[PDB]
Each structure stands twice: as C-alpha cells, then as structure tokens.
C-alpha cells in the first residue's frame, strides 16, 4: 500500500508516519498537487487546517475524480465528533471518519477495509 | 466534427451526440457546432411546418460534459481579454437557451445523461425540457471551488424546478449529487439502470409523439409566461465575465489542476 | 337551475351545488355560476361583508368532469372559433372569480366528494382551499385527445408546485387519488367518505375567527402572486387555436368520452 | 443603545446584538431606528472602502431572539386612530428587514443567529437574512393572526423564496409555532445546531463564504435583477397592514394586551 | 391546583368533584392564568366563541414570550385523528374523551409532575 | 366468461379465439374497435395486443382509465406483446393493466391469469 498523509501540525505528521510507504505534506492544496503527479492507495487528511480545510479538499477531490482522475479513498481525522461535520464529509466523498488522537489499531484496520 | 448527428426525418427525432472526435468540455468548437446545428435544424423544421419535433442531447464520451473550457478561461483572464471571454459566454448562452425554447421550432428537448455532468454540462442538461439520467451518474456545479459561479443559466433553469433560495444554495455549496439524489430534489426527471437510457428516451419520445398539438401549445404558453428570456441570461453572463476577470492566482491554479484531471 | 344555492346570510356562508337538475361544464352551468358570482359579489360588497365564505360543491356522484366535449366536437367540426372562444372566456371568468374571492375577498372552498377531471379539477384548483374525500380521483385528461387544460390549470398549480412539475402533470394525463394529491400539495385536506361537509365547516369556523387577517391576505395576494385575469384570457386564446386544429382521431376520442360520461 | 455592535474591520465581519439595554424584547421604535441607522452607516462605510462580500450577523443579547412588533404601541395608536404614526413605524420596520435582504446595499452576507424564540416581526427579521442559523429548542412562528392581524414585515415575500406561495399563506394564517428541527425540514431554516453552538456555526458559514467573495457578490447582483424582493412591494404590503390594524376591534386589542403582559 | 374551563355548566361541576377552580370560557381561563399560577389546566375542545385549539395556540405564544409553563389536557366528544393532530402540535400533552373516563384523567395528571 | 380480444393480425386473433373457446369470444381489429364494442356490450375481461397501428394497447388503457372514472363500468384488461421490455411493462402497469403476458401466448398462463380476475 502507498499512503499520503496531510496535517498542519508538526507533531501529528511524525507519529502517523512511524506507525505506518508514506509521504507527508503540510496543506490541503499540496496534497491535491501530490495526487495530480503520483497515484496513491489511500489518503489520510486532517479536517481542521488553515486556509483550505479537509472538506474543501474533499469537495475539490470529488470533482477531480468525476472528471476522470483515478479514485483514491479518503479517511478524515478530527478532534470534533459533531454529527453535522461527519455527515458533510461523507456526503462530499469520505469513506472513513476517525476521532483525534486516533488509536493506531483502528486506523490500520480501517485502511485494510479499503482494500 | 465535435458532433455526431443522427437524424430520423420521417419521425422527426434528432440526436445530438457531443464529443464525437474524442477534454470533454464546452470548447469554442463544440459550442459553435451546437449553435450552428440548432440554427440549421430549427430553420428546416420551421419551413417544413413540423409539429412538435424531438431533439436529444447526448454524449459519445464516458462523461456527459464537464462544463466550461477552463484552459481557455485561464488564458483569457491572465491576458485580460474580456471581449473574447464575453463572446464565448454569450455563445454558450445561445446554445442552452435554444434547447430551452425548443430551437424556435417548439421542439421537445431531451437531455440523455449517461455520464457525469459538471458546471456548464449540468446547465446544458437543465436547459432541456426532460432530463433522463442513468444510475451512478454524478452532477453538480463546481465553479464556486475556483471562486466563480454557474452563469450559463443554472439559476434560471433551476428556478423552474425548485425555490430561488435552494437554487442559490446548490450554486454556492459546490457539492456533487447522484442521479437518485437529483430525482428526489426534482432536478432530474427520470433515473434508469446503466445502459437503459436510450430506451427510456424512446419511451418519452413515443409518449409525447401521440400528443403533438398539446406539446406545441404548451410551448406557446411557456413563451408568454415562465420561459427564461434570452436577454436575462445575457445579462447574467455579463456579471459572470466581470467576475471571472477579477479572479486571483489561487483560483487560476485551482482551474489548472482541474484542467489536468479533466 | 343547474345550481342549487344554499345561503346563510347571518353567517355569510354560501353553498354552490353544481348539477342540481353529463356532469360537465355546459354553457348553462357556466352562465349560472358566473351569474351567481356576480350577483353574490355585488351584494357582499354593498353590505360591506368582511371575509365571506363561498363553497363549491356537487349534487352529482362526481364533482365535475370538465369541458362540454360534445359542444367542443361540434364547434371544431363546424369551424366556429368565435363561439368556442366565447365559451372558453366564460369558463375563465368563472374560475378566476373563485381565485379572487368574487371581488369581495371571499374564502373560496372546493368540496370534492366525487371525481374531478379536466375543467372540473381546474375549478377545484381555482378555490383557496380544496377538501377531498377518500377514493376521489382527480386529473387532467385533455392530452388524451391532444389538447391541454386551458381553464387555469397551469396558473393555479404554479401557486402550489414548481412550473416544471405543473407541466409534467398537464402533459402526462394521469389520474391521482386524493391521498396522492395531498402528498403532492395539490389538495389541502383528505377526509373519510361522507365527512367532507364537517371538514368544510371546520375550515369555515377556523377562518371566521380571523376575518380581518383573511381579507388583508387577499389584498396582499392581489398585489403579488394572484393570477391576473388577462393572463388566463391569453391562455384560452392559445387553447381555442389549438382545439380548432384538432384531427379526426382526437374528435373520435372525445366522442367516446362523451358516451362514457 | 438598544444595540451592542461588535466590528471586525480587518475581516469585515459585523455583529448586531439586539436588546443590549435589557438590564420587552420586541421591535420598539428605538430598536428599529438603531438598526436602520447602523445599516445605513455601515453600508456607506463598506461602499466607500470598496469592501467585497462583507458579513453582517443579526443576533440577540436576550434569552429570546425577538418577539416581534411593539404591541403596546400598536394598541395605543389603534385606539387613538393615529394611522400616520403606525404607517411610519411599519415603513421603518420594512427598511430594516429589506436592508438585510439586499445586503445593506453593499452586497453583504446577512446571517441570522437565532438562539432564542423568534415570533412575528422577529421571525420576519430572521427570514430577511440570507442564512438562518438556529439552536435546538428554539421556537419560531407568526402569531399575529391570533389577534386578527397578519405578518406585514415581509413574511410572505421572504417565505416565497423558500416555499410555495400557498404553503406560505397557510403558515401565516394558522398561527402555529414551530421548533428549529421542524423549520429545517420545511426549508425555512438553513441549519440547526446544539444549544450554545450557534456562534461556532456562524463562524463556519462566514469562513466558507469568505473564500468565495467574488462568487457571493456576483450572486447578489443576479438576485437584484431576478428574484430579489423590491422595497416598493413590501411598502405596499405594510400599507395594507396598517389599514387592517386600524380596523381592529376590542377583542383583538385585549388579546394584544395579554401578550404585552406575558412579554 | 387545577383550573377547568367548559362551556356546558353541567360539565363544569361534575369535574369539580373528582383544590379546583372552575371558569366559563376560553378567554376567562387565560385571564385566570395571569392572575395566579396553576399546576395543570383541563380544557374542553369544542367551546363556542373561542375553542380549545385557539387557547392552546394562544398559550403557546405566551409561554414562548415569557409566561410560566403549565401542561394542558384536552377533553372532547370528537376523537378523530385530524382533531388530535392540531392539538398535539399546539402544545397539548394529553387527549381525552367526553364524558371523561375517571381512571385515565387522574393517572395522566400524576405523570406530569 | 365473456371475452373481448384485439389484435391487428388475423392469425393472432384466430389462435386466441380457438384456445379460449376450450369462454365466449369476440375478436376485433384494433384498439378503437374494442372501445366501441365495450360501449355496446359488457365483457368480463379484455385481451389487447400492445402494438397495433393507429391506436395501440397503452392508449386504450389510458383512455379506459378516464372513461372508468367518468362513469363507465370497470372491466379488467390484460396486455399481449412480443415486446417484453420492462420499459413497456412499466408503462402498462402504470396505466392500469391488470396482467402482462408474453406472445406467443402460453395457454396455461393465460387461462390461470383469467381465472384470477373473476
Ligand atoms: Mg489540526
Ligand atoms: Mg364541547
Ligand atoms: Mg401487433
């Protein structure tokens, strides 16, 4: 499996890379740039990021995949467990939704579900 | 040559297949070919006095239509060429308005959507009187994602089906919707299984072919009541072009990424 | 004598029962309705009555089956556009009067206890409130003989549903049950068989306690969403021109419906 | 002083908190003049600075949003036969709510934050905004029929943007109250959030439309030339409203008096 | 502390039998509720002049305006689903038939507080 | 049972008449003629061919629906065609057709469905 993780915080990128082939990038705009060049099995993204957020990226990715781009499942991570935010993401195209800080065992099992 | 035209003169059914020589978007060539054929077919139908002809808008691509020529947009915006962008926008309006008023020959316009329809593509489907969609097809208006809005009649056509307020939301949210969802929202008229769209169109044609006087009369009633005036749509694209000209580098880069994907 | 009129002057409630003596809008029935509308409206205006109630009902086992098709067939075959236009215009005046409350800001209530087809359904839609009993069927079958509903179907439905859905309903020629129409928003209340009168009485009693509010709302309608008479008149102009162009297949269909009525 | 104004000039977000000096939460003459006065002031500042797609939020400092018209004032003017002053009040209420509808003449995004009950004019004021955020447990409705009047501050005009003309009529004449969840299903409210989460929900809406300011402003221009409610139309509706109010009897006036005391 | 309102003068006294104040009319119970506080109000649906539904609608707005909440139970000879429809959406918690069943009246009143 | 049959081809009318006599039958050439027959006499069930020139089976169903709501006696209609597409089956079912059977008709399936009616 080939992974692509995106988070604005420095501490979050490092802990996820150690427990998991992984590429890490900062913003939501950059993960859209990274996906345009390379192909990935799954994308892990933080919901609340400055500038462009997880949902804005999700909507933009949805139109890209509908335009012809190869499908990649997206799992979202967030501190907010609010039911209104979960519904909006899966209606934008999200396949999984996990709370922060995420338990390692449940992340790996949900990644195994996608394949 | 961007179109594949199938004509059935003895039955007065006419099929327009987009993207015959294949980005599956409304390029200048595709727009000119559509308007050129609309004008041609409409004049032939009028002089022959054909009552309630049927025109079908379909696609030869695996998508229906992905909307405006974004690569052209990026270029004209960066060059500051308002005149050419307005020209393009006005020609897109003429194309979709012609479907809305039945080519000036009181035709029944049917959109056959067997692949994804985005932006201008969705607007073109909405310009037809009947929308047939196949299961798994996605439609939406993603132009807000690069800080623009749908100016090819999205608002005008949706207001025929839903409230002005809900139409506004849909235009500004930038979500995609499945055929089943759009059916529930009243934005699509029929959803059929994959590869059954043609048969569904044939049933619609056969249904309205038996009531040609009723259809033609209803178009006259539309003309004098709820029909969207061409002028209204032209003024909407004026706003569209002025907005597009003010777009920044972040929007232009978003458009560039979509161009590469599309 | 096509109408049975029940007047309650001290309560200002007025009942119009169609078909007192084919249960369709004949010339006699139309003239009797418009004649009574004009009469009652003038009496209500001069007496300064606030928010009177007018009920459109039927003495037949159906509500109303629509236009006088036997008359249509004859005028179309004879090429008499002038008389067909005259009929169509008088039908418009009848249904528009219900829509604007007889020019006296009345509350118009349609009591539909039997089937309402074509013009019959249009007459129900011209009222402000539609009460239907279970098992009642309504629809617009004029497309089945290549015509369209020109007595305000489009104008009245556009008050309740979208312009696009209104178009579909007018061109499909399906019949709908009361329960279906309720879900579609084309009917306001569905009650069990033989309970319609009581349901109308509840509506009357409800709006009788807010007569100033009702009358003010009619004024607001007048200056906003109310259907202008002129608009409907121009729609029947298109209707007559279409009817005059009808072929023998349509005329035979109309003849078969005449015999079934 | 009936308003508490919070301005964020560098972000162009402006908060209007009603009932700042409640230490009856209705549209009093003072409150209406303060709103229109601020709308005119802020709108002129936004136009001259050429601000693109500013955000204006209508909120409340009371435990209710707004209970509607000043009924105590209504009772007095009706009993005195003062049509001129009642018309003046009604016209000023129209200007307040229409300004929200057209974005203060500066193409602003108007957001109603409803964290307490909104009745009559209060509900009409929420409906005048482009987006309505409501908290759970909040009740809204149009109770003016209960004293034989109707909502004349744009209820009909604003609801017709969201629902059918026929359903709008029913709601205006039934006099029922509806919960936030019910209004959401009816399409009369845009978002329902848990208690004490309204501000965060408004911030998400602001942040969402802040990234598409050109698209928002262009859409206002499109509204202006199509579906926007003309001021003149609303003015003529309040003319009918005042004439109706002047004809009200003692039973209606007593009903109004009882509501005044409960307020 | 009960407050009962009915148009029939015979129905008023028979409910008083099984800390209860009776009043005649729907406007009079509203005037009583402003005078002093009550625990629950039992009202007849079909009263001339002003009915139970109008009182419920009027109380609903008053309670939303700032008045103390008091639960309401409705009595009527009518039992149709279209009559309960309007009452339960106006603020009523319990619905009962006429003449009232003594067992269902007392039990439902205890469930409130 | 009293049966009314409509098919535009002579052979089809003949095979249907023969098999269901082993009921009383009247065979007619099209959709308009069965409607004319139903006004003159009453029938227990109508068997109609879907595809006929001029007026087809689906029109007849839609015309009968309004006629039956206008005061005409109700009578069951079963449709026959070599067209067995769900597209065509949906149309007839929506128009009030009680049964849709494939052509060439299976005698066992026709008679059992007719027995279910009355
Ligand atoms: Mg974060
Ligand atoms: Mg009683
Ligand atoms: Mg055949």
H helices present in chain B, as ranges: 28-47, 70-79, 82-100, 120-126, 154-158, 164-173, 179-185, 197-209, 212-223, 230-245, 249-261
CA distance C177 to B47: 44
Q: How far is the CA of B211 from the centre of ligand 1 (A)?
A: 61
d(CA C180, CA B247): 49
Compute the distance from residue A83 Cα to the ligand 1 centre, in Å.
Answer: 18
> What is the C-alpha separation between A100 and A47, in angstroms, rounded?
10
Output the six-digit token pair for B207.
């249904």
C34: domain CATH number is 3.90.226.10
Q: Is the peptide bond before E99 cis (omega within 30 degrees of 0)?
A: yes
Beta bridge partners of A46: A77
Q: Are residues C215 and C204 in the same domain?
A: no
Per the CB < 8 Å rule, is C260 touching F65? no
Do B188 and B254 belong to one domain?
A: no
The sign of the torsion formed by the CA atoms of D95, D100, D101, D102 equals positive
Cβ contact (<8 Å) for B258 and A63? yes
Interval between CA F1 and ligand 3 midpoint (Å) = 24
Query: What is the three-class DSSP state of D188?
Result: coil
Give the burial class of B173: count Cβ atoms within 10 A of its Cβ; 0-12 exposed, 13-18 middle, 19 or more buried.
middle
B196 contacts in chain F (CB < 8 Å): 87
- CA C212-C214-C220 angle, to 5 degrees, is 105
Tokens of A77: 């991570």
- Cβ within 8 Å, pair F59-B210: yes
- Chain F residues close to B200, C-beta within 8 Å: 87
SS3 state at A57: helix
- Nearest Cα to Cα of residue D108 among D19, D18, D251, D12: D12
Same domain flag for D175 and D262: no
**D90 and D31 in one domain?**
yes
For residue B213, the CA-to-ligand 3 centroid distance in Å is: 26
CA end-to-end distance (rounded Å), chain F: 8
Strand, helix or coil at B56? strand
Q: Residues with beta carbon < 5 A to ion ligand 3?
A: F 8, 49, 51
Q: Which residues pair with D114 in a beta bridge?
A: D134
Contact between C49 and C12 under an 8 Å Cβ cutoff? The reply is: yes
CA gap B68, B149 in Å, rounded:
11
- B122 and B69 share a domain? yes
What does the DSSP 8-state code read for residue C63?
A: S
Please provide the DSSP assignment of D161-184 as one string: TTS-HHHHHHHHHH--EEEHHHHH
Spell out the residues 6+ positions from residue A15 whose beta carbon is closer than 8 angstroms to its own. none
Q: How far apart are CA C259 and CA C252, in angstroms?
A: 11
Instruction: Name every chain D residue with its beta carbon within 8 A of the beta carbon of C159.
Output: 164-166
Q: How many CB atoms lie within 10 A of CB E49?
A: 11
Number of domains in chain B: 2
CB B131 within 8 A of CB B190: yes
Q: Using an 8 Å CB-CB cutoff, list chain B residues near C238.
A: 217, 220-221, 224
- Please give the full DSSP string across B148-186, using - where no structure is assigned: ---TTTHHHHHTTTS-HHHHHHHHHH--EEEHHHHHHHT
Cα A90 to Cα A104: distance, rounded to the nearest angstrom: 22
Distances in Å between the Cα of C72 and the Cα atoms of C11, C12, C242, F70 are: 40, 37, 12, 17
Method of elucidation:
X-ray
- For residue C169, the distance in angstroms to the closest alpha carbon of chain E comes to 29
Q: Which residue has the tokens 């109603």?
A: D112
Contact A59, B138 (CB under 8 A): no
Q: Which residue of E has its CA nearest to C195?
A: E80
- Nearest C-alpha of chain A: how many angstroms from B13? 30
From C146, C162, C170, residue closest to B186, measured CB to CB: C162
Contact call for A and F: 3+ CB–CB distances under 8 Å: no
Domain around D254: 213-263
Determine the structural domain holding residue A55 and report its residue range. 1-115
In angstroms, rounded to a whole number, what is the distance separating the alpha carbons of residues F65 and F42? 16
> Is residue C15 located within the same domain as residue C52?
yes
CA distance C175 to C142: 12
Is C159 an 8 Å CB contact of chain D?
A: yes
D263 contacts D26 by C-beta, under 8 angstroms: yes
CATH number (domain holding residue A100)? 3.40.50.2300
Alpha-carbon distance values, A60 to A57, A76, B123, B174, E92 (Å): 5, 15, 19, 8, 49
CA of D25 to the centre of ligand 3 (A): 76
Report DSSP letters for E51-68, one per residue.
Answer: -HHHHHHHHHHHHHHTPP
Strands F45-49 and F2-6: parallel
> Nearest residue on chain B to F56, judged by CA atoms?
B210
Ligand nearest E48 Cα, by number?
2
Residue F57 CA: which ligand is closest?
3
Burial D45-72 (b: 16+ CB within 10 A, else e): bbeeeebebbbbbbbbbbebbbbbbbbb
Distances (CA, A) of B69 to A36, B262, C260: 19, 10, 59
Distance from CA of E54 to the nearest CA of D (A): 8
Residue C78 belongs to what H/E stretch? Answer: helix C69-78
Ligand number, closest to the Cα atom of E76: 2
B245: alpha, beta or left, given left = phi > 0 and alpha = psi -120 to 50?
alpha
Closest-approach residue (CA) in chain D for A52: D211
Residue C1 CB neighbours (<10 A): 8
State how far the Cα of E71 lies from the Cα of E38, in Å rounded to an integer: 9
Interatomic CA distance for residues E24 and E6, integer angstroms: 6
Domain final position from B177, B195, B211: B211
- List residues in chain D touching A: CB distance below 8 A: 191, 193, 197, 211
Strand order in the sheet with A3-6: A22-25, A3-6, A42-46, A74-78, A96-99
Kindly list the strands in the beta sheet with F45-49, ordered across the sheet, starting from the edge strand earlier in the chain.
F24-28, F2-6, F45-49, F77-81, F99-102
Residue with tokens 């809005």: B149
b/e E66-93 (16+ beta carbons within 10 angstroms → b): ebeebbbbbbbeeeeeebbebbebbbbe
Residues D233 and D113 in one domain: no
Same domain, D20 and D149: yes
Rounded to 5°, the CA angle F111-F112-F113 comes to 90
Burial class (CB within 10 angstroms; exposed 0-12, middle 13-18, buried 19+) of E48? exposed
Same domain, B74 and B16: yes
**Using alpha carbons only, what angle is made at residue F72 by residues F69 and F77, rounded to the nearest 5 degrees?**
85
The HSE-up count of residue F95 (CA atoms within 13 Å, CB side) is: 28
Residues facing residue D191 across a β-bridge: D133
Q: Which ligand is nearest to the CA of A80?
A: 1
| Torsion angles phi and psi, residue F57, rounded to 5 | -60, -40
Same structural domain for residues B130 and B234?
Answer: no
Sign of the C-alpha dihedral, residues A84, A90, A93, A97?
A: positive
Enter the tokens of residue B51: 């009552």
- Domain final residue, candidates C210, C234, C250: C210
Report whether C250 contacts C147 (CB < 8 A). Answer: yes
Q: Does B208 touch chain C (CB under 8 A)?
A: yes
Of D139, D255, D261, the CB nearest to E34: D261
Q: Which long-range contacts (CB under 8 A, 24 or more apart) does E92-95 make?
A: E92/E56
How many domains, chain E? 1
State in Å: Cα C117 to ligand 2 middle.
Answer: 39
Task: Give the experimental resolution in Å.
Answer: 2.5
Rounded CA separation A3/F25 (Å): 74
The tokens for F71 are 């005061």
Beta strand segments in E6-113, E:
20-23, 40-44, 72-76, 94-97
Contacts of E89 in chain D (CB under 8 A): 176
Chains in touch with F (≥3 Cβ pairs < 8 A) = B, C
- Dump the DSSP string for C175-232: EEEHHHHHHHTS-SEEE-TT-HHHHHHHHHHHHHS-HHHHHHHHHHHHTTTPPPHHHH
Report the relative pairing of strands C13-18 and C3-8 from DSSP bridges.
Answer: antiparallel
CA atoms within 13 A on the CB side of F40: 8
Indicate the pairing of strand E2-5 with strand D177-179.
unpaired
Q: Do chains C and A touch (3 or more CB pairs under 8 A)?
A: no
Q: Are residues B85 and B103 in the same domain?
A: yes
Largest CA distance in chain B: 55
Residue among C88, C110, C116, C74 at smallest CA distance from C241: C88
Q: Does A84 contact D193 at a Cβ distance shorter than 8 Å?
A: yes
Sequence-ordered list of residues with C-beta below 8 angstroms from that of D185, at least 6 positions apart, any chain: none
- State the maximum Cα–Cα separation within chain D, in Å, rounded to a whole number: 55
């Amino acid at each position: 499996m080939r992974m692509l993780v995106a988070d604005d915080h420095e501490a979050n990128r490092m802990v996820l890379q150690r427990l998991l082939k992984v590429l890490c990038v900062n913003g939501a705009e950059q993960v859209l740039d990274a996906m345009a060049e390379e192909d990935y099995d799954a994308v892990i993204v933080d919901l609340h990021m400055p500038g462009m957020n997880g949902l804005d990226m999700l909507k933009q990715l949805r139109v890209m995949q509908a335009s012809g781009m190869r499908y990649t499942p997206v799992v979202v991570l967030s501190a907010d467990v609010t039911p209104e935010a979960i519904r909006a993401c899966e209606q934008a195209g999200a396949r999984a939704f996990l709370a922060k800080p995420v338990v390692a065992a449940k992340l790996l099992d949900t990644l195994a579900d996608l394949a | 040559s961007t179109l594949r035209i199938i004509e059935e003169p003895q039955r007065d059914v006419y099929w327009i297949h987009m993207h015959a020589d294949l980005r599956a978007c409304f390029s200048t060539r595709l727009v000119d070919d559509i308007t050129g054929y609309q004008t041609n077919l409409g004049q032939r139908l009028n002089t022959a006095g054909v009552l309630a002809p049927h025109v079908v808008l379909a696609s030869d691509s695996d998508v229906f239509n992905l909307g405006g020529d974004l690569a052209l947009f990026c270029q004209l915006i960066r060059e500051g060429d308002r005149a050419r962008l307005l020209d393009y926008a006005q020609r897109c309006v003429r194309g979709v308005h012609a479907f809305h008023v039945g080519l000036g020959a009181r035709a029944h316009s049917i959109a056959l959507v067997q692949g994804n329809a985005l932006g201008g593509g969705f607007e073109a489907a909405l310009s037809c009187h009947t929308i047939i969609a196949e299961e798994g097809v996605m439609m939406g208006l993603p132009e807000v994602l690069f800080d623009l809005f749908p100016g090819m009649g999205a608002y005008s056509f949706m207001c025929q089906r839903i409230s002005a307020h809900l139409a506004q939301k849909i235009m500004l949210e930038g979500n995609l919707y499945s055929a089943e969802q759009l059916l529930g929202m009243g934005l699509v008229d029929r959803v059929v299984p994959r590869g059954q769209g043609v048969a569904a169109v044939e049933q619609v044609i056969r249904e309205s072919k038996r009531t040609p006087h009723a259809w033609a009369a209803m178009q006259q009633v539309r003309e004098m009541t709820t029909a969207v005036p061409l002028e209204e749509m032209m003024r909407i694209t004026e706003i569209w072009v002025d907005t597009a000209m003010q777009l920044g580098e972040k929007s232009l880069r978003t458009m560039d990424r979509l161009v590469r994907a599309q």
